[PDB]
Write a protein that binds this ligand. Structure first.
Ligand SMILES: CC(=O)Nc1c[nH]nc1C(=O)Nc1ccc(F)cc1
Length: 274
């Protein structure tokens, strides 16, 4: 702190509190996160170089008085608050599609540098007046969690981010969370009831996962047409590939960018009341 005046609390993150603050030198308005190892130090410092138009810029890491503060580019609103704000008519599809396309771009970036987010969720997704959307708060909600994580895979891949983003995608379209678990088992079982209990056909190796049980109930898959009306056939094809059980079949961000759903992408501006 010190060289930064807290203007307000804007969140109580996973790894600490987030403040809007103003730099007493630069004059600059930033987002200041107070965290709470040399290893936390080295991976954090790797973040400072992961720079992309769809990634919140990490301005500075202050390791001082034996505390950790992260200084971030300030954005004025997150996608959760924009969703609650837009619930009556919903986010216009060209806006949903621009948002998805840019997040795919951020993820294409991170993933090509072997960085996973691990915890995407509408609250970590930040928006500006210019129509941009950025990824923040890189890795108690269970809702956007990939099923390989829920099944206890320890060495899971970039495909987890693709799964979270498809859940966010579906949520923007229907104005309700795709899979609102309130426990890990409820989360897993909600995924199962919509998509089918997975098996060796759709996901080789699933019955050998650590937390998999033969006693899991055996639900049938519902059809996507019922899951996210009124997403068009392109949107639905893409969403279906983002939600493949097998993380190895699940579409990449780079491949998803080439999907015909984006043939007509544009960059609308949202109407944001700050
Ligand atoms: C976690 C993190 O890095 N957050 C941020 C970085 N820049 N801006 C933020 C942030 O949380 N901005 C908001 C401002 C106002 C809101 F209502 C919500 C988010």
């Amino acid at each position: 702190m010190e060289n930064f005046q807290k203007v307000e609390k804007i969140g109580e993150g996973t790894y600490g509190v987030v403040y809007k603050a103003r730099n007493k030198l630069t004059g600059e308005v930033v987002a200041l996160k107070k965290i709470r190892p040399s290893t936390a130090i080295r991976e954090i410092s790797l973040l400072k170089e992961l720079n992309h138009p769809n990634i919140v810029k990490l301005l500075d890491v202050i390791h001082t008085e034996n505390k950790l503060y992260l200084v971030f580019e300030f954005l004025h609103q997150d996608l959760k608050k924009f969703m609650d704000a837009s619930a009556l008519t919903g986010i216009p599809l060209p806006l949903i599609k621009s948002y998805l396309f840019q997040l795919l771009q951020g993820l294409a970036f991170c993933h090509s540098h072997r960085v996973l987010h691990r915890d995407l969720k509408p609250q970590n997704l930040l928006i500006n007046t210019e129509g941009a959307i950025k990824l923040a708060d890189f890795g108690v909600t269970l809702w956007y969690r990939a099923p390989e994580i829920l099944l206890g895979c320890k060495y899971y891949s970039t495909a987890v981010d693709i799964w979270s983003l498809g859940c966010i995608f579906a949520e923007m379209v229907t104005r309700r969370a795709l899979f609102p678990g309130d426990s890990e088992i409820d989360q897993l079982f909600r995924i199962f009831r919509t998509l089918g209990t997975p098996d060796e056909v759709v996901w080789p190796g699933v019955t050998s996962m650590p937390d998999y049980k033969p006693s899991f109930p055996k639900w049938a898959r519902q059809d996507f047409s019922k899951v996210v009306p009124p997403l068009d056939e392109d949107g639905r094809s893409l969403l279906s590939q983002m939600l493949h059980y097998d993380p190895n079949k699940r579409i990449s961000a780079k491949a998803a960018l080439a999907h015909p759903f984006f043939q007509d992408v544009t960059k609308p501006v949202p109407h944001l009341r700050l």
